[PDB]
Design a protein around this ligand. Structure first.
Ligand SMILES: [Zn+2]
Ligand SMILES: [Zn+2]
Ligand SMILES: [Zn+2]
Ligand SMILES: [Zn+2]
Length: 154
């Protein structure tokens, strides 16, 4: 079937169709709102627009999953799946212990963190091992830009 472009909402007739999550794009519509460069690599989406990494970061900050405060661009962060935290907010909600690199924990669906010991006692969460602190740059990844073609049978 012929998808409509998430950008311009027209049917995409190009042989190569771009896919960002489960939305389809014209390659000529998947351009940074700011600098107009084609997004070959990663797409950074916010509200009604899409950006390159540089122009996304120049413009937007990241909220901590836990405290909902801004994380300064000049500070490292912790990550569990897609969630981003201040180091001091990367802590068990039950015992309040700050998790260190390598610590075993469980991530609840909404981003709440539970140390292994407290989770298993209380017991669902996803089991994880705490990653090293990451630079604010490499924290938000954006979405991969995938490629598909029209192929028979149609
Ligand atoms: Zn389009
Ligand atoms: Zn840009
Ligand atoms: Zn925080
Ligand atoms: Zn705990």
């Amino acid at each position: 079937q012929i998808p409509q472009c998430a950008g311009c909402n027209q049917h995409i007739l190009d042989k190569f169709i771009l896919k960002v999550l489960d939305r389809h794009w014209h390659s000529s519509c998947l351009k940074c709102a700011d600098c107009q460069m084609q997004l070959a690599d990663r797409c950074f989406s916010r509200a009604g627009s899409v950006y390159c990494k540089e122009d996304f970061f120049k413009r937007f900050g990241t909220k901590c999953t836990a405290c909902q405060q801004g994380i300064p661009p000049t500070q490292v962060v912790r990550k569990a799946q897609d969630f981003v935290y201040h180091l001091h907010c990367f802590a068990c909600i039950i015992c309040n212990r700050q998790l260190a690199t390598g610590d075993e924990f469980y991530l609840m669906e909404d981003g709440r963190l539970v140390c292994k010991e407290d989770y298993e006692t209380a017991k669902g969460g996803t089991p994880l091992v705490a990653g090293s602190p990451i630079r604010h740059e490499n924290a938000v990844q954006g979405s991969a830009v995938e490629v598909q073609t029209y192929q028979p049978p149609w």
